[PDB]
Design an enzyme around this catalytic site. Structure first.
Site, PDB file in Angstrom:
ATOM      1  N   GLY B   9       0.816  -1.196   0.000  1.00  0.00           N
ATOM      2  CA  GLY B   9       0.000   0.000   0.000  1.00  0.00           C
ATOM      3  C   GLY B   9       0.853   1.249   0.000  1.00  0.00           C
ATOM      4  CB  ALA B  11      -1.575   6.017  -0.135  1.00  0.00           C
ATOM      5  NE  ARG B  33      -5.635  -6.028  -7.010  1.00  0.00           N
ATOM      6  CZ  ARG B  33      -6.936  -6.216  -7.199  1.00  0.00           C
ATOM      7  NH1 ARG B  33      -7.748  -6.318  -6.156  1.00  0.00           N
ATOM      8  NH2 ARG B  33      -7.426  -6.305  -8.429  1.00  0.00           N
ATOM      9  CB  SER B  34      -3.379   0.681  -8.311  1.00  0.00           C
ATOM     10  OG  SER B  34      -2.922   1.857  -8.954  1.00  0.00           O
ATOM     11  CD  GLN B  74     -10.692   2.072   1.260  1.00  0.00           C
ATOM     12  OE1 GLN B  74     -11.131   0.933   1.102  1.00  0.00           O
ATOM     13  NE2 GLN B  74     -11.170   3.122   0.601  1.00  0.00           N
ATOM     14  CB  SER B 127      -0.332   9.149  16.305  1.00  0.00           C
ATOM     15  OG  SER B 127      -0.529  10.523  16.562  1.00  0.00           O
ATOM     16  N   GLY B 128       0.950  10.917  13.784  1.00  0.00           N
ATOM     17  CA  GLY B 128       1.967  11.876  13.402  1.00  0.00           C
ATOM     18  C   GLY B 128       1.753  12.503  12.040  1.00  0.00           C
ATOM     19  CE  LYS B 182      -4.175   6.923  15.182  1.00  0.00           C
ATOM     20  NZ  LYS B 182      -3.250   8.055  14.944  1.00  0.00           N
ATOM     21  CG  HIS B 185      -3.618   9.756  20.031  1.00  0.00           C
ATOM     22  ND1 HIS B 185      -3.986  10.303  18.820  1.00  0.00           N
ATOM     23  CD2 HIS B 185      -2.496  10.412  20.413  1.00  0.00           C
ATOM     24  CE1 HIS B 185      -3.132  11.256  18.491  1.00  0.00           C
ATOM     25  NE2 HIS B 185      -2.217  11.341  19.440  1.00  0.00           N
ATOM     26  CG  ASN B 186      -7.133   9.532  16.381  1.00  0.00           C
ATOM     27  OD1 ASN B 186      -6.043  10.079  16.543  1.00  0.00           O
ATOM     28  ND2 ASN B 186      -7.386   8.734  15.352  1.00  0.00           N
ATOM     29  CD  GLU B 189      -6.139  14.497  16.596  1.00  0.00           C
ATOM     30  OE1 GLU B 189      -5.138  13.751  16.529  1.00  0.00           O
ATOM     31  OE2 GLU B 189      -6.912  14.689  15.635  1.00  0.00           O
ATOM     32  CE  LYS B 259     -10.462   9.961   7.231  1.00  0.00           C
ATOM     33  NZ  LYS B 259      -9.367  10.654   6.495  1.00  0.00           N
ATOM     34  CG  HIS B 450     -36.622  -0.781  37.298  1.00  0.00           C
ATOM     35  ND1 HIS B 450     -36.388  -1.773  36.372  1.00  0.00           N
ATOM     36  CD2 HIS B 450     -37.359   0.161  36.665  1.00  0.00           C
ATOM     37  CE1 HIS B 450     -36.959  -1.446  35.226  1.00  0.00           C
ATOM     38  NE2 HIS B 450     -37.555  -0.277  35.378  1.00  0.00           N
TER      39      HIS B 450
HETATM   40  O1  LIG Z   1      -2.038  11.169  13.327  1.00  0.00           O
HETATM   41  C1  LIG Z   1      -3.067  11.097  14.034  1.00  0.00           C
HETATM   42  O2  LIG Z   1      -3.070  11.292  15.266  1.00  0.00           O
HETATM   43  C2  LIG Z   1      -4.374  10.765  13.382  1.00  0.00           C
HETATM   44  O3  LIG Z   1      -4.310   9.495  12.720  1.00  0.00           O
HETATM   45  C3  LIG Z   1      -4.717  11.851  12.372  1.00  0.00           C
HETATM   46  O4  LIG Z   1      -3.795  11.832  11.277  1.00  0.00           O
HETATM   47  C4  LIG Z   1      -6.133  11.624  11.869  1.00  0.00           C
HETATM   48  O5  LIG Z   1      -6.231  11.984  10.488  1.00  0.00           O
HETATM   49  C5  LIG Z   1      -7.108  12.466  12.674  1.00  0.00           C
HETATM   50  O6  LIG Z   1      -6.542  12.863  13.929  1.00  0.00           O
HETATM   51  C6  LIG Z   1      -8.395  11.696  12.912  1.00  0.00           C
HETATM   52  O7  LIG Z   1      -9.387  12.683  13.134  1.00  0.00           O
HETATM   53  P1  LIG Z   1     -10.467  12.940  11.980  1.00  0.00           P
HETATM   54  O8  LIG Z   1     -11.483  11.844  12.193  1.00  0.00           O
HETATM   55  O9  LIG Z   1     -10.951  14.339  12.281  1.00  0.00           O
HETATM   56  O10 LIG Z   1      -9.667  12.814  10.704  1.00  0.00           O
HETATM   57  O1  LIG Z   2     -42.135   1.654  30.562  1.00  0.00           O
HETATM   58  C1  LIG Z   2     -41.469   2.430  29.840  1.00  0.00           C
HETATM   59  O2  LIG Z   2     -41.932   3.491  29.377  1.00  0.00           O
HETATM   60  C2  LIG Z   2     -40.050   2.079  29.500  1.00  0.00           C
HETATM   61  O3  LIG Z   2     -40.003   0.811  28.833  1.00  0.00           O
HETATM   62  C3  LIG Z   2     -39.210   2.025  30.768  1.00  0.00           C
HETATM   63  O4  LIG Z   2     -40.063   2.049  31.917  1.00  0.00           O
HETATM   64  C4  LIG Z   2     -38.358   0.760  30.789  1.00  0.00           C
HETATM   65  O5  LIG Z   2     -39.136  -0.358  30.345  1.00  0.00           O
HETATM   66  C5  LIG Z   2     -37.837   0.489  32.194  1.00  0.00           C
HETATM   67  O6  LIG Z   2     -38.936   0.468  33.115  1.00  0.00           O
HETATM   68  C6  LIG Z   2     -36.819   1.547  32.608  1.00  0.00           C
HETATM   69  O7  LIG Z   2     -35.596   1.264  31.936  1.00  0.00           O
HETATM   70  P1  LIG Z   2     -34.177   1.700  32.560  1.00  0.00           P
HETATM   71  O8  LIG Z   2     -33.857   0.548  33.477  1.00  0.00           O
HETATM   72  O9  LIG Z   2     -33.276   1.844  31.357  1.00  0.00           O
HETATM   73  O10 LIG Z   2     -34.440   2.995  33.290  1.00  0.00           O
END
Ligand SMILES: O=C(O)[C@H](O)[C@@H](O)[C@H](O)[C@H](O)COP(=O)(O)O
Ligand SMILES: O=C(O)[C@H](O)[C@@H](O)[C@H](O)[C@H](O)COP(=O)(O)O
Lengths: 466, 467
Positions: B9, B11, B33-34, B74, B127-128, B182, B185-186, B189, B259, B450
């Site tokens: 790969g 790229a 591969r390409s 990829q 990372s970098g 990793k 880390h992001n 970030e 991402k 409950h």
């Molecule tokens: O080097 C790094 O720490 C990451 O791999 C970086 O290169 C990545 O592209 C973004 O941090 C992910 O964040 P996005 O989802 O915003 O791209």
């Molecule tokens: O009756 C309802 O409207 C809901 O189904 C809710 O009551 C659920 O069934 C549990 O009673 C509460 O769920 P949690 O335990 O996530 O609070």
């Protein structure tokens, strides 16, 4: 000779639904793999038209075609085990109805697999608790529309009725749409309870209000626009005194329990790209709630300001009330934005106005508030966000002053307000034409060569910044 | 006739890593591969020990055994497809290294499946960026330990070197622990950038400062305890100009790209039951930034307070600095709590001090701040939470006054501060001996039966609340 509908799994939820169905004049067959629960239902059914069966074969043969079978068994593998056992015994066109608290992605799988055996599968959300199932719950059924219409008469008879007579049940959409919006209802329920808890925390920690004054305040709030089931029982809860005439709620361990539905909504919002901050903060607030002994140890090491309030407590109480109502609007606006996207991504063609309609009664989040959401979508079916509704817009335009005062006072006094803080931050971000996301895009272009667009030029650009 | 290591790969990321390896005196076989990309790099590697291959069979047969293959394909199907075709050609003991932005669960699956065929598999976080991959990146390899040891020399050679002389690479743990760390880390970030973005938002909308004053402030901050790669490049960014004297950063569309690793961290925290509020708010902040047309229409219908500030701007700007530094502490504490929980569940035996060690250079979140995290775990390997570290504890004890003033001021002036707000809420929640979850539990017992537990006695209880 044959009954009209059958119920498998006779715990209290299955017993109450079957009894509800029978109370409307329908004949019901019942089955439970452990026949002792079947043997107590029959003794509790003297006079009722409840036909017990002690085998899946006898149960299936007890029902008129197309068979209508309600599954009220433990969620997960027990449900799949009950489905797989029924499949050889069914005929084409039979209808299975899963009324458990099921993840909608399992419903999508079961509906897809069963359909290839010419078997209809309806995943139905049921809200209202034990008492709701016996008298009139909120019902969110999803699956084959034709199979829904064959059971709509039964669902319509057992569902809770709104003040305009309309039953709190309607066809949600294909496959998992019903169980999906039941999950979102629970996520909204999380935020409702957390916002009430933050109001309670402000009244106790910041205002020093007794349990009697706390109950009376919630009762006064319940007589106005905030009228809701959750606020109603919150008033009753602070009235429940114990052995030595003390608030029983004050002696309950502050570790909030959970089933999946809470974290499921937040995970789904992240997968869909929806800012569900308020509900997610509530789910996270339950997580911090659970590490009690860690918090107890941290309280001895980390200091904070001592909560004090020198102003008019009744004026500030009203600001909390406005803060609670505005945060509900922001929380629901997020929850309905999630359903709009899930409708689009899953091609469910959801009618959001109908969801508010069937949530006006039966369910836990039931409130007059739900009628105004229905009014919003009745007035504008293409409403892009609840905040833009004329009524709701007029509220948050007004109440934002109290919400800001409540959040800032809570932060300066060390009282955590994650739900209040999330709501005002959501309102301020959603209305912002320009956010500091341009700096985020500049940094991502710096270290990752991720490119960016511009506000004046149209196209894609990359910059060597150094 | 054979090469020591191979890269699939080509790229920019796989290219620069292959050049990094070759720069250390190693022989590298390359494949893509390409073949378009392969022909280009041989032109770019005139005089370097880079042997190009043009078939998967030729690639495998050109490496000395045990074969060391760095996959930079990829992420997703293309990576699983490459593994599936490499497998019949490999021999027992061979080592595959996936260095893409891979979901750690996929690494767990590949590692255990390939282990059944006596094939070692290493999921390595990288990372970098492109430049960091060329000179010295942070590397988070996870997999079989004796497979890492057979490639540890190469990784230690190419990794960034902290000024201790230590390289920014460690055996993280088994299977997917490398790609997991990793991913976190992001997530960390994302929060660092959102906090910086909020600090900048307070300068522009509340204090009225412009790009000149904003840039010099971030440089002033980058001289003290807040010194970080991200804060440094922020000061540079606020100086790049439109050639019409305008700040180029201001006409960039405020729709933050994103991402997987960002939302992956929050989804994982929600699965683990970890309160990752600050990173998650930053993920959510990017979501709401994407609906620009939805926001500009709301901007004309939903009004708010006109941001105005009258006090001493230099005192308040210092308060924003303390708010930024304390928010990092809470955010990193949440992230390191997540990693602690994840290692517990996966038996990864993570050493969080080593993580902060290899994030001191090479990676994107690199900062002197991460020496203090290392110093925390070196001071207390059994550290419950970064907030309880004596150094961090003293910081948040004093800085909390500022963070409250910043959050309260931004809220009153309509400037959203989701990272600042969730950080002080996390501090006030984590240190709260008694939270209002007692009412939530009472309600759940009311409508759901409950049941609940009590603070005074012990056991489980259910109550008839109304008569
Ligand atoms: O080097 C790094 O720490 C990451 O791999 C970086 O290169 C990545 O592209 C973004 O941090 C992910 O964040 P996005 O989802 O915003 O791209
Ligand atoms: O009756 C309802 O409207 C809901 O189904 C809710 O009551 C659920 O069934 C549990 O009673 C509460 O769920 P949690 O335990 O996530 O609070």
């Amino acid at each position: 000779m044959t009954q009209q509908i059958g119920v498998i799994g006779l715990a209290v939820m299955g017993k109450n639904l079957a009894w509800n169905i029978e109370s409307r004049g329908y004949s019901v067959s019942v089955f439970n793999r452990s026949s002792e629960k079947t043997d107590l239902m029959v003794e509790e059914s003297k006079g009722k038209n409840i036909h017990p069966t002690y085998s899946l074969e006898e149960f299936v043969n007890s029902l008129e075609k197309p068979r209508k079978i309600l599954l009220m068994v433990q969620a997960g593998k027990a449900t799949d085990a009950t489905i797989d056992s029924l499949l050889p015994l069914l005929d084409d066109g039979d209808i299975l109805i899963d009324g458990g608290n099921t993840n909608y992605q399992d419903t999508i799988r079961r509906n897809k697999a069963l359909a290839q055996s010419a078997i209809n599968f309806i995943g139905m959300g049921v809200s209202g608790g034990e008492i709701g199932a016996l008298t009139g719950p909120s019902l969110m059924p999803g699956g084959q529309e034709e199979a829904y219409n064959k059971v709509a008469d039964i669902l319509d008879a057992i569902a809770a009725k709104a003040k305009d007579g309309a039953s709190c049940v309607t066809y949600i959409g294909p496959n998992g749409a019903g169980h999906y919006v039941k999950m979102v209802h629970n996520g909204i329920e999380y935020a409702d309870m957390q916002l009430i808890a933050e109001s309670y925390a402000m009244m106790k920690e910041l205002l020093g209000m007794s349990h009697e004054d706390i109950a009376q305040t919630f009762k006064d709030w319940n007589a106005g626009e905030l009228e809701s089931y959750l606020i109603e029982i919150t008033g009753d809860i602070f009235m429940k005194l114990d052995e030595n005439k003390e608030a029983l709620v004050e002696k309950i361990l502050d570790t909030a329990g959970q089933k999946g539905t809470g974290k499921w909504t937040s995970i789904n919002a992240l997968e869909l790209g929806i800012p569900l901050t308020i509900i997610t903060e509530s789910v996270f607030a339950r997580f911090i709630s659970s590490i009690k002994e860690e918090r107890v140890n941290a309280s001895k090491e980390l200091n904070g300001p001592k909560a004090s309030f020198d102003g008019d407590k009744k004026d500030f109480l009203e600001k909390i009330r406005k803060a609670l109502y505005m945060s509900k609007i922001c929380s629901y606006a997020q929850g309905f934005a999630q359903m709009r996207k899930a409708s689009e991504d899953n091609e469910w063609n959801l009618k959001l106005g109908d969801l508010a309609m069937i949530w006006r009664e039966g369910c836990i989040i039931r409130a007059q508030f739900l009628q105004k959401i229905k009014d919003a979508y009745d007035n504008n079916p293409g409403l892009q966000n609840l905040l833009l509704d004329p009524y709701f817009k007029n509220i948050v335009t007004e109440y934002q002053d109290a919400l800001r005062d409540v959040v800032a006072t809570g932060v300066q006094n060390g009282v955590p307000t994650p739900g209040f803080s999330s709501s005002i931050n959501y309102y301020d971000s959603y209305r912002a034409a320009d956010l500091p996301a341009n700096l985020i895009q500049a940094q991502r272009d710096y270290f990752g060569a991720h490119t960016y667009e511009r506000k004046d030029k149209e196209g894609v650009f990359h910059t060597q910044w150094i």
